[model samples]
Each structure stands twice: as structure tokens, then as C-alpha cells.
Target chain A: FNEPLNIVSHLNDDWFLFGDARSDCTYVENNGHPKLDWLDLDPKLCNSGRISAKSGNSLFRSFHFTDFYNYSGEGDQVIFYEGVNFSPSHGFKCLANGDNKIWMGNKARFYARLYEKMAQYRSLSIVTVSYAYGGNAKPTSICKDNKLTLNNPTFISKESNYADYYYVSEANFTLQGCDEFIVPLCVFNGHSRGSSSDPANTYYMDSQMYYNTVTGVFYGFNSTLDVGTTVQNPGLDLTCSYLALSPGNYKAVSLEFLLSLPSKAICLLKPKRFMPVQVVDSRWNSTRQSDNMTAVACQLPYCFFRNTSADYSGDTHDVHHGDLYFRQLLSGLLYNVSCIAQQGAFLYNNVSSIWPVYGYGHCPTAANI
Target chain B: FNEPLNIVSHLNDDWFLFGDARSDCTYVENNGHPKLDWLDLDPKLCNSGRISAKSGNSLFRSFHFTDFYNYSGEGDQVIFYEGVNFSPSHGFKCLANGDNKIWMGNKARFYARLYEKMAQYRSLSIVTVSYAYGGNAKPTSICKDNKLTLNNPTFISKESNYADYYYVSEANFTLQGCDEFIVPLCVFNGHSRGSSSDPANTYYMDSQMYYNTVTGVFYGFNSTLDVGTTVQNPGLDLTCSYLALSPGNYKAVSLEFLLSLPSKAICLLKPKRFMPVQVVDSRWNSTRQSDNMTAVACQLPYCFFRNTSADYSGDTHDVHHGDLYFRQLLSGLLYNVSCIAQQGAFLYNNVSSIWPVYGYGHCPTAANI
Candidate 1:
């Protein structure tokens, strides 16, 4: 059964590939013909093998299986799954003509490994094949599904888990005419921003805008910047990846960047040493100089009769969460007040109740009754 | 059976009259009977056993037996415990006496309960049971046990767990002519200083010089003052409960007040986003200054480059612990250094060698050729 063939596979976050030069997928036939085993095969290693980019910048060709399942083609594209899925595999097929040049887009890489069935029918050949994603042509947008749109909106105000004044633009990016395409939510310029030391100048060429797993909404943090502040776009740039080329530019309306500050109860400064006094003076002022020598030795040996009082300041701070409450007592009478975000105090007053009403009228002079 | 008898019992810190105006010990049997139950008795609810001062203040007469074992009579001198022994009890005893005044110094109160068991054998009583540890008589130093010797030294600097600039004078105060005496390591006036609101004017008649317990030793923190500077003592005081009466003024010498400051490892300002550029220049310097195109465009996208480092202050404190370390690979020439506290920096600087560099040169720019 001679048929025109090509293999397409999906990688993580909007990254996909289409391989067809034939040599890219080789193997000897068995029984009658080689089955198109799209997914599973002992992709342990392959032929036309050359240097592998992994071990170094060398020429290589090999198929490596990963620890994933159903590593096959997506949807009606291909019906196969004999290997793992989502695991990365890399290798370029070498040329058979001894002409080191690859007959297929040798740089083609896929997430899952595919098995090789060396030219099932050596007689099986190709008529025509063209359009490699990064060629001299403008790319096309496979984002018609919108589910794979790689556009990130700007983030203005900082919210919990979200950055303030951040940016992300997929502008000027394209997807070459590949069998299918994805966002390639990866980067070229920099890497993990949150874990970066100096994330300020460490502009992010790639960042996750949609917090799909958490808020399920569009949210993120960036290298702190303005909306179109060119130089270092604090957001992710898809063009940074060679695989992000397009047949032509595809423009989508800017998604709205929304953030709201939610209100909730928060605890702040609490009152420490500010409470009503227990008891007061018990004294008899020495009247030798009654007016001037007011130093009366109160019954207060328990002496509050005529005593000098000392005052001090307690801790004070601007209220952040709760209200401050206070009360004082005098002659069995009671008084108190509460205030919010206002000033209150825990003081050690001597001479008098800073306020006429806040005293424990027991100072020697007031205990005549 | 007839024998000499007096009552003696251990009191906690706050000493209450445990010894019934009962002779320091005396006996003249009634008819021909000397209580076989000498010091031991069903001393539950003695006479006048009503509202236990143990609960409230009241007058009653009874012999109270503490939860003590073998609480018999003291041989000759003061049978006392070493340190903070002989405080006070809050129990009461019932009695069967109609005596108005106590021959045995009946003015005794526990917890709040008072007892009246005047010298039942006045004829066989003592010569002013000379050292009533807590009575209207001159007290003597039965603490000759030196175990109770209150000697505090100068606490100029803080250390161990005691306070500084605090003094206690337990000299001259003796158990003169009293039945028995124990160290009245109790306090008057105020309570724990750390817990006191107005610690200053709240003059403590006495304070604990040596903080025996954590709460004791850690009695305070103040604006460090002087001995005579009566304003703030910022510590606890020790005063034996008593009618601190004096027969001809004899001020006891001051006890020592020794305190030392404790030392331990402590950390200060730590490093943050402060360090040299991990790498260098990239695209057009926002200022459009394509510097000699110094845009060596380090393989760094998220590059923390030679930007106008709006450098905020990094912790510029002396490194008390670990040394600052760094590594630099400018032009394939590896460079690294480490330095200790003396001339190091928790900084964000750039120099021939940020005298002790700190770096993260992990990018391709530093990759070996």
C-alpha cells in the first residue's frame, strides 16, 4: 500500500510539529508492509543516526521513548498510541546519500518518540514535499480554535499573587505553515522570573498569564513596566522561540486586563498596657506649709495622702485593623469610650487625669470623706 | 506526762503567724496531763473557725496543722529552710479558748484567717520569745545558717539572668528577741517590674535582689538608673512581712546586686536583590543609546545587565557569622573570592572587586569555549 505520509504531534503549551521527508521516519518492512505505528515503538534509538544536540552540537539521529503513555498522534490526525506522551525526545536524521545535508527538516523535534519501520517498501517514494515552518515564507495562524491563543494582557494593579504594572504581548509573532501549531509558551531571552535574583532587569520573554490551574483567570507578574514600553517588555515574547514563526501575522483583539482588590478582616496593633487603675491614694498631707510643702505623708505608708506621682509613655501606633477602647473610674463612678483608626493611649498620668473625668480621685487631698 | 512545749511550723514566703501565741515552747501539764499529741493534733477546725481569712479576713482561734510531715518543735534556734523558704499559708485552725489577747503573740493571720491561742501556759512561757520573725520586736539574723545570708553585689553590667543597677539591703535586719525567724524574701509595694504599669513611682518597699527563678531573675528592664535615684528601680524588691519596727535606728547594710549581660549569636540585615550584575548588556538601551552597540547581548534575555541600577540600600551591616562569597567569569577568566565580617558587604555594588564579591554567573555568556 503506497501512500503519501506525514506525522504530526502536539507538545506542551501550544508547541507542535509536522514531519514528512520520509527519511525522518525510517525502518525495514516486515511480512508484507510496515504499519504506520504513529505512537508506540521501541523508540530506544534510531538509524541514519548522527550527532545528537543533547550530548552536544553534533550530527545525530535517534528515537528515545519517555515515561508517558498513549504517546501517539492527536485526534483524527493519526490513530496510534504505543508509547508515552508528553515526554521530550530529540535527534536529527542523517542523510543516506553520504551528503551530510539532511533530506528532511533535520531539526524537527517532538515530545513523544515514534517507532521506525525502515523504508517498508524501498520502492515507496515521495513525489513532492515543501514548506518548512522557519522557511522564507510568512506563517499562518492555527489559533483558529482560540483555545490555543497565546496572547497575554497587561496587568496594572498588584493583587494577591498578581504583579502590579506587568505586560505580555504576542504581537509580531507567527506560526509557519506547519501541519498544526501551538503557543510554545516558552522563552528565549530569560527564564523563571519569580525565582530570578534581579527580576527587574531580568525581563521575561515568556510568562504564564492565565493562571489556569489556580484562579482559572488571566493573571501574572512581570518585570514591572508600562503597557508599550518597548525596550524590555516586562511580559512574555513568543517571537523569542525559532519555532514561533507564522505564514503571516495573525492579530487578535487585546484581552482585557482586570484586577480587583477584595476586602476582608485583617488584625493590627492591639492595646497593651492601657487599662483602668485598681486603687488610689490613702494619705494626710503635712500642713506645716500646707500650700507650699504639700508633701503630706498619706495614710499610704498605704501612703497616697500626699505623694509625688511619676508618669510615662506606653507604646503608641497608628491603628490598622481594630478600634481602640478605653474607660476610667473615680469614686465608684465609671467612664469609657471607643475609637477607630484614631489616637488612644496607655499612659501613666501623675498630677491629674489628662482629662478632668479620667481620674481615680484617691490622691490624699481628695480622700477627706 | 508533762513537758516543755512551744509550736513551730514552716511558713512559705509571706510569713503569717503559724506559731500560736503558743510559747516558743512551754509546758506545765493541766492536772497531770501533758497532751501526748504534743505538736500533732486533729487541728482541723479549731475554735472560732468560721469565715476562713483563707477566704476572707476574719478573727478566730485555732491550731492549724499544715500539710507538712514531722512538723514538730525546733530544737533550740530558728528551724528554717534555706532560700525562699517560709512564705505564707492560707489555711485556718479552730480553737476552744476565750482569751481576748494572746500570750503567745496571738496577732497572727494566714491567707486571711487569723488564730488566737494565747500562751495557754503563761507561767511556763518564754522571755519574750525574743525573735518573732514577723512581730513587734527587733528581728535577728537566724540566717546565721548563712544559707539565708542576703548578700547582693553591684550589678553594673547585666549578665547571667539578673538585673543591673539594683540593690537590696538585708543586713542589720535581725531576728532580735523573736521566737524563730526565716528569710522573709518577700516583697511589698509592687509586684514583678516587667508586669508593673507604673514601675517608677510604684516604689516597692522591698525587692528581690537575686532572681532565683526565671520570673525572679527576669524581673525587669528599665532605662538603667542609679541606687539613690529613687525614681525607677526597674526590678523586684524583697522585704520580710512584718511591722518593720526599729529599736533605735539601725539601717542594715545594702545587699549586693550583681547582674551580667548574656551573649549569643545574632543576625542583622541580610542580602536581598543586592549584588553585582549576574551578566551584561542586551538590545537598545531604552534610552536608544546603542552603545558602541555594547549590546554584547549576553546570551541573557532575562538579563540583569549594566542598567542604571536604581540600587536601593542592601543590608550594609557587619557580617557576624558567615563570609560573603562570589564568582565572576568576565571573558572566560574565572574569578571568585570570599571574605569575613570586617570588610564585607550585604550590598548591591560594582567595583574592581566589590571588596568581596557575590554573584550568580550561571549563563551561556560564561560557558567554556
Candidate 2:
């Protein structure tokens, strides 16, 4: 309980993958820090930009996303520390140009945690989080999250020919009276807009069978039967066409239980009746303007979610369920984060493998829909 | 609309209620203007008594009582409210004793609401509910709820004649901060203690129904076709019961959900968190004194009937759920306490009337056991 922990976190509430593009992987960070990082794959990942999603009218459908993450930051070792009074406005830069910024969409998922101790009795200041990719990278083409544009209707429909590497980044801040914190975990997503990449295949392998240490895998990669499989060629209906993204599609994600048994309880200290709020950059949007923000600006006071307009014509699934997993980290506990480029794990699972349910079809489904 | 509306307030965490043998159910004068004198059931009705409830290790179980209202209190009004504060050191009186003190040995269905505004923002005084019996004469014995000592296994076996007119006399407060509640409504035992002239059949023939004012009926209290044989002198095995207490056994009542959706947002306003304390009281137990006293000095926290050794060494098909109704009275929207008394209208509820799936003989059936 002595040595200071790292100041790091991971997130992916929005930006889901479609048929061939489903991205439901867990981020596993090493170095033994008692922590619990909850990640939510937004159901609206496809309905955004060039695609739309049908809502209430449909049944048992899900939008998919890469749920991609990478710590290609400058730090030699990933920082895993937590503090209090830390706000949700701390920014996170993407390792690449395209992934440089955190796209909270009109509605998305961001994170809040506590790290470091300050002087004031409750000196915990609110720290905001954001994503900033590498300053240089040819403006990061629509490698993944493609925004609909007549110019790129069929954006990157094929798999990458080379072992291309792209990483999303994040950053934290240091402020007076904002030092001490006991954040199990918290998230806040700003409106966002980012590039898009064709849906790729990832796997939820077992911790025992194999250890995914690095990225560098190609489309032709095949996992051993007992260990992994080409998620794209699952032995079932998965052979169907990759998820199609139609126009006017909107995605909304419901974040359910965010943290599980997280030890820390967030005691928003400061303004007495309430605590100070961390100012956040406007979320991702085509206009990317603050004024275009929803009724309320970038901060969330209570648990919230949005409408993943599955339908382009009318109603959308503005539901809030089975998503968020926020188990507030207590004063003392442990957690983990993970990232690997082009790598695929095994099918089914073993001890600690991230595996839940997955749905078929890309958000709006019809390409010209 | 500007002044927070006429919205009801909530009794903080600990609205206490206890009783002593000396606790009196006396008449009182309300409104200095000398309106008809109203009876003030001593909130102290069921204090230190020869009775103790079994909230645990019992054939039946219930949540800890947060408020024990005087079951014999005057008037025909009962108010149930919610929304508690969860801030540090912020609490409330989770229980209030007034009427017959029915709470004496009754376990509350968790989440039972309590009024926090009856006494105006004054720490949401003790939960106040009034059940009116026809005429001032309290019946000595009744067909139901007779104070039959359970020392004998066949206590409820022989429909032994017991006086009926059960006006409030004792209310027991055990634990506090319970939200859901259970007020036994039936053709069961509602005693007149040492009397012999009172009606033993405690069936509260709701007189309100005669007024043609439908309130709870909408909530689905439709008991139309009387099934089976309305057997008379039928022991707990064959005799018919009502639906008022079925909520406790309703399939929907999963102990899991009741304990989970605890209005996490309501942690502060809980009565215990902000208990109302007092410096003096003669009736309360002198040896085990609570640091706080809600309402009057004699009240104790609420609790449920665990059928302790004193009450019932054996077990019976004791039911607990019921469809409680509401009506907008001249006094505003309040608990219609008379549904179990004044013999008022109970919306002819048959919907909640859940029958023991098994036909008696070691029932609730061994499976439900």
C-alpha cells in the first residue's frame, strides 16, 4: 500500500464493430496493480456516420465495434496510478493521427479515476480525460471509425494488406488541491467524430492456452484449434457478409454496472452541496462544436446513456441496459489494462478471458439503406 | 411550482416507535380551533412487551423494521413517502408509531414508503397511518388474528371463537430504515387483549367501497368468483384468506431485487443516517437506550414478525403481500388506512389473492419451503 500506483485507464463505450468488424475484447494491463477497469462496447458503433440502426422495432440485434486500445504512448512503462478529486476532463491522446482524439460522439463513454495525493484536506481536484493521437500521422485516414461522406461511401471495405499499426492515446493532468483521489473508476464520453476502418476479426482466447504479448498479426493468421481460431471464419452463420453500414444510422449505448466490487467510493469533495466539475472538450461530431452539445454540456452528474438510433426512419433504441459495468474502485484494490495490435486470441475461454455475448449484422445493415 | 411544489417530504432514516404496557391510546384535540376531538393513539403502544418478533431463522422472513406506526392512532389517514438523503451523518426517523401499533411484531415488506412531510419538513415525523373501526367500542374477540399463544401446534387449527372488534392498541418497532412495509389486513386475529365481547373475525370490511369511490381497484384487486368451498371453521388448511398480504409472497418479490435497487441515490435521507434524538423518555427501555429518538420519547425502530418462541414455536401458512391502495382524499393523496379497518372499500381485489400452491398439510408446500 506504499509505492504510488500508475495513472492510467482504458475506455470504449462507443465505436462498435459490425459482422466481420465485431470488437469485444478486454484490455489486460500487467504489473500487478489491484484494479478493475470496466469496458463497455456501445451498440451504436455502426449507426454513426454512414450507418443507421433500427431501434425498438427489431429484436435481439447488436451493433459491433473494434473496442481497440493501445498504449503506444511515450512512457517507457504504462503508468497505473489513481487519485481523488480527479475530474473527467483529463485528456488522452491517440498514438496515431486518426485515433488522436477521443470521440465521445453526441453520446459516448469516457473514464474518470483517482490518482496522486494533494495538500488540501480534500484537495482532490476534478481531472478531465481526452484522447490525443500522435501530432504527426497524415491526419490518420478513416482507418476505422468512418464518418459518412459521399466521397468515401465504401470506405476501406477490405482488410489491411500490411501489418499496419495504429494506437489510440490518452493523457492526465496535475493540479493543486486536486492531487489525492480514490477513484475505483469513472467514465464520461464527449461528443466525438473519428475515422473508420473496415470491420476486422478479434478473438476472446484463454489465459491458460496462450499469452497475447504483442500485435503484428495478418489477416491470414490462424489460431491453433485448442488455443484460437480466425474469428472472421467462425464455424457458423458468421460466414455471412460483413456488417453493412447504411446512411442516417445513429448509435446509442447503455452503460450498465460500470465497476464491479470496485473498492473506492467517489466522495466528490469541494463546493460543499456539490463538487467542482471537470470541463471536457466537446464530444465528437461532424461540426465538432461545443454549442452543438446536448442540453447539458460535457459533464455527467448521474449515470447516463443515449439513443443508438437503430432506425433511420423513426424510433431508435435509446435503451440503457446490460452495458455499463462500474464497480467503483475503493480506497485500495487492483485493476488491469490491455492492448495489442493485429493479434487474435482463442475462441470460448479459460481463466480471465474476456468473453460475453455477441450479435450479428452491422448497425443500419443496408449499405445504401 | 417554484417552491418545490406541495411535494411530500420523507422521514429521515430513523422514525422510531416503541411501546410500554402503560402506553395509552387516548383521545386528543387537533387544530386549536376545537374541531371534533381526534384520538391520538400513543405512538408508544407496543413498547417493552411480552412479545418479540422473529425476523430471522424463521419459516417466514422479512426485512428489519424502520418505523413502527401506532396502529390505534385516530383518523382514517395513512401516508407513505420515499426519497431519502444519503449524505454523511444525514438521517431520518425511518419509523413512526401512531395507530394500533400494529408494527409491534410485524415485519415490513422492504421498500414500504414513509411520509417525511406530514409534520412539514420537521424531520419527516414518525410514519403516521390511521385505521378506523366502526363505532368507538373496540371489539373484544374476532374470528381472525386472535392473539392465540402458539404454544400449541393447533393454535389456528380450531376456529375457536375469538372477539373481533380490533381497534389499534399496540405497535412494535424493532429495527429501522425499512422502506417496504406490511400491515396485516384480514379476517384473522386482531385482538382486544383481555376482552371477550369483541368480534374475533378481524376482517376489515372496507366501508370506503360503499362510497363508490374506486381507488385501489385500478391497481388490480379483483377477487371475483369465490373459488373452492368457502369452508368455515376451516383451519389454516381450509379456511379462506385475503390477498392484502400476498405482496410478501408474490412471485415478483425476489429478495435479491428488493435488496439491490435500494435507491442508491437515497443513502443520505435514510432515517438512521440522520436520526432524530431526544434527551428524555420514561417509557423507552432504560437499559438499552438509543442515542436518537424520533417522534415522541417512547417510540422504537420498526421490525418484522419472525414468529419468535413467544409468538409461535411452530409455523403456519402466514402470508405477507397485499395490494395496498391509494386515494386522493380531502387531506390529499394519503394511505387509506381504513382498508383494513373502517371496513372501507378495498377495490374488491382478487388479483393479489395468491393461494398456497399446495393444499395444506405441511404447506407453502415443502418446495416453497
Candidate 3:
């Protein structure tokens, strides 16, 4: 036979060749004629390879031969016993005695070749051939068939041998595409409260906003124009994120990672102080002619009294000596009235009630009991 | 004796009178002449009063006779023993065995008279006659002596009897004059983070500013214009109080009272959130054409190489098939350079360091050693 020529091999590692054969002159003399014999080697024989007996028994193995057997192909078959099928095609099967074998085709063939090629580079080995779903374990047999049936396939790692066989379906093994994710940069500016000499006193402002360095603009849930505006309503919307980004930008990060930044990790101190509203009527007056007198007098009703039998009885007399007599007479009364009014105002404002009314009898005097 | 005529009494309660004297007819026969005897009653006798013996022994007694004795007065004296001073003037003293007494004069007389007059009013009694220095216990002696000597006089309440004598010198017992203390009203406006429908979600703004309601003005240590401004420095001046007041009004209060207000009693909650900046180089690229690609490439130096023996050898080839061959060739190198640059930016910004320099070797290719 002439030496095989034009040999070609595919991903399966199976060699295909074309050859021509002629009768040998020696054979022609013995038989008094020429004789020719040709052999057609099946690609399946070259594609056949061994799987670890331990992996074959492991239900945790991600690509069991049973799963691959269900995969469809033109001339693909599977076996569980030591028997050869008559069909000249690719096949895969797990032996009843815990041995596994495969005749690669399609995706299975392609994966094996890729793994081998990657392994050839010392810097990139089996570790570089990561499963799309993420794991490091050898498969009992490799195949991808959308129509294959699975019994509670949990899609776990093949290295996980604690339970039954787990396999990821074709649908779950999706390839991610290439697109851009732009994350916005956040900017912060604020004041601190401490000695300027100490670096420890330095602090970043808690008021944060996203800045588009490219556009020279700032973005936040609250308007930048309203940064210093008084928060007038309890329902005012104000939201923030340590990992802020501008609109139309993409890049995702775990909240845990964002908050874990050194600056963010430091506890923030917001400057705060009380802005007190005066409750109505916290002031009063006195006659002691002193420096620390009350500035404002309480607004309330007043009652005056005088002795009718006294020599000084005219209105003029009352006015002329009011500071000396009448004023003294009404001092206590005025004080009491003011006190009542003050208390009423306080109660009204705090309790959200209407101003109260109080009634009093005639003022006490020497002549009037 | 003829009834005394034209008798007059002063603040000292001492009487002064003028009378005409004449010889008695019955006594004229025995003496053969007219004789007249005049009796002058000293005001000191009338002004004498007793103080509690227990108070005399109390070192806590504020107005001790010793302190009053040193007080200067015209014709005034004090006796510490059972002996009388023959001076025709007022005097005060305490007995050796702790019996306290006083002879009213000047402020002493005035204070005693005022106490008595006020006591006559049923509603106003001894309790109303509070000492300027504040206490209810009777003094060992009543006097106002500016020239009096004091031995570490603490000016404490006379009612306190636990230790050494505590006296309020005339200078220390100052009368507070009438003056105004204007407290600025503080205004607060802010937001709360909670369900709007819940009353518990209501909260006053922590940022406070003094408001002059009369003038419709606001005042605070920090400019009102900077209320919500980001704090960029460590020494921003900000101060506040729950009992804020206008610039010059009067009516003093204890701090304990101000902080004890019901509105201030609630624990305040300040709403806060984070705005985060992106750290340099937190992303990378891959050839697997995926949706989660890095948007921005790192600004860094790049190196390119190609097999000189290969058919493709022009700048156009380097640009065209670069995505297929050369890009793949330099992918790892570009990734590493980008990583270094990203980290360099991060370090430069955060650690405030100068940009760093990194050295690399020539690119490796199949044609090059």
C-alpha cells in the first residue's frame, strides 16, 4: 500500500487521510493475480479517552457520562458495559465498574483541544481554563445539549462531592459580552471642628455630591443651589451614597466595598446646634430701679384700687402720686396677673391650644377688704 | 410731769420730744424753791432686739455681731458681755455664751421696719424678707458694715449651719439693678428621615441661628449664608444654645432650666448619607466580548511588537489586524501597565504622593528571544 497522503486532523484529534493501494508483485506470483486490502480507521477510536474511576463514581462530577449520553449527535451513542457498538461514530459512556470514557465531538471536542493548548503554555495551565460558571474540577465526560434531561441538577462545582451529580445546563452557561461601564466620580467639600495644627482634626465634609469632571457639573439628590438652604420640611428629600456616580455612567460595586473605603470607613461627625424659638412670655418687670431690669413687660390686663375716704381722692391726685401710692398698691396684683398670662401663653403655644381666660374679683385694699 | 409734746420718731424707732418744765407747788414748800428734773430716753434702748441663741452659736450665721460691731456709725457701739456702754447712741452685740442681740440703726433699722411692715400683710411674712445674699435664718446681729472685717467670708446662706461663720459683707450684698437682658430667638429649619405620617418622625433642624423677631434678622456664629455649606476646614466657628436670646434683653436663667425644656429633651437624630469618589483604576478589560466592560482606559504608556518574519508588516497592518493579533499579543502587557497607572493615581490622590515611575523590558514575541 502506498503511504497515506494528505492527512488532516480536526478538533477531535482524529486523523483522516486519503491513500491509494496497488497489488504487490510478490502476491501476484503466489496467487497468479493481484490482490488489494484497505482499512478505514474510525475517528472515534482516536477521540476515545479515559476518565478517572473515582470521578466516574462521583455523583458530584459535573459532566457525568449519563448526562453526555443524552446529548444528541448524528452518530453518537453511549454504553455502560464493555461492549462495542457497530455504528462507526463518536460515543461516550461510563462503565458499570466505575470507569468513564468519551469519544469527543462538537463542543466536547473543541473544549478538550482548547484545554490541551492552554495547558501547553507554562504560565497558563488548567487553572486558566475556568468553567464559565466558576469552578476547578475534571468532568467525567463533557457535552453540551440543551435537550438533555436532568434530575434536580443544582449546577454546583464538580469538586463538591458531598451530594448527587450537579450540572449546569446550556442556558445557564452564558457568555458575557463586551460593553463599557462608566462610573461617576464623587466630590466632597466641608469644614472641620478641631485644632488646625493637628492632622487628626482634618475631616472630609459629610455633604457629598457627584461631580462630572468632564462637564464641570455637580449632581445630587438635593440641588446644589440649595446646599445652604434651610431644610424647611420634614419630608424634604435628601439622599446620599458614598459611592456616588453621575447619570448615564456605568460601573457597579458591592455596597460593602464602597463603604469600606478608608475615608468612608471613618465615622463622620456632622456639625449641629440648636436653633431655639422663644416660648411666649419668658420675661417680667420690677420697680427696684436697678440695672438688671426686665426689658419687655408682659401684656396683660391690670386692676387699680384706691381708698375713697382718703383726702387725696381726685383722679389728678391719683395720677400725681401714682408712683408713690397707687402703683405700690397694684404691684402685687400686676405681678400675679402677669404670671397667669405668661403661663397661659406658654401652655397655649406648647399644647397648641386656644388662649385661656381667667376671672378675678375686686382688688384688695385697706378700705375695701 | 407735763405730757411730752411734739414727739417724733425716725427710722431708728427712737423717740425725740420737746416739753416745758415748771416747779411743782408741793415741792416748793420743802425746798423753798422750784426744782425741775428732765429725763432723756436714749433711742438705743428702743431699738434693741433679740436674735436666736441657736443662730448665735451657728458659724453659718451670716450676720454675726462681731462683723456688725466693726461697722462704723456716729455714736454707735457694741457690747459682747453683760456690761452696758454709757454712750448715748445705738449699739449691737452678742453675749459671750452665744446669745445674739442688736440695736437697729441705718440699714439695720430700715430692714427691721420693712420686715415688720411686710409681716403685717398676712400673705407676706418673714419668708418674704429674703436677704440680698439669699437665706432664711435670722442673723446673729443686723447691720450693714462696709468697713467691717471678714475672715474668709464665703457669703453663703445663713441657714447653712454645718461649719464656720459665713458673712456677706456690705460690698458683697449688692442689690441688683433693673436692666434688660435680651435673648435672641433661635430659628431652626431642617428635615427628618422617616415616615411622614408618623408624629415621631418630626424633628427640628439641628442647625441654629439667632433671629431678632423685632428686626426680622438672623444671627449665628457662622454666616447664615453658610448654613449647609460643606465644611472644608477644621475650624469653622459654630455655636448654639437651646435658650437663645436677642442681643440685649434681660431675664437670666440657669443652664439646667434651659436644657430641661421638653422640646430639647427629645434625643435628636440627624439624617446622613455617603457620597463616594471613585478610586483610580477599579476596572479592567477582557477579550470575551461582554456587557460589563471598562468604560475608560487608563492613561499610561504602551509598547507594541510583531513577528518580523510574518507576512503582515506595515503601520496599517498594525492598526487594522491589531484587534485580532497585536492587540491579543499586548493584552497582558497593556493590562499590567493600566493597573500600575491606576494604582499610581490612587496613591497620588489619597496618600498625597508624587506620581511614580515604573520601568519595563522590551516586548516578547515569537521572533525575539
Model 1: residue A229 alpha-carbon error in angstroms: 39
Report the lDDT of model 2 for residue A242: 14
Q: Residue B185 deviation, candidate 1, in Å? A: 2.5
lDDT of each: 0.19, 0.18, 0.18
Per model, kept true contacts as a fraction are 0.00, 0.00, 0.00
DockQ, per model, reads 0.00, 0.01, 0.01
lDDT of 2 by residue, A14-60 (tens): 11111111111223446553322222223332233311112111000
Best by lDDT: 1
Q: Model 1's DockQ? A: 0.00
Between prediction 1 and prediction 2, which has the larger lDDT? 1
Put down candidate 2 lDDT per residue, B67-107, tens digits, no spaces.
Answer: 22222111111222111111111211111111112221121
What would the per-residue lDDT of candidate 3 be over residues B1-369, giving only the tens digit for each residue? 111111111212211111111101111223432222110122222223311112111111112223221111110011011001111121222111111121211122222222222111111111001123223443331112333222211222234442322222211111122111111112111221122254643422222222222222222211122222113311111121222222321211111101000111111111111101111111011321111001121111111011111232223222112122322221221111111221221111111122212211111111100
What would the TM-scores of all predictions be? 0.13, 0.20, 0.12
Model 2 clash number? 247
* Residue A357 accuracy (lDDT) in model 3: 25
Off by over 4 Å in 2: A1-122, A125-271, A275-281, A284-369, B1-61, B64-287, B291-369
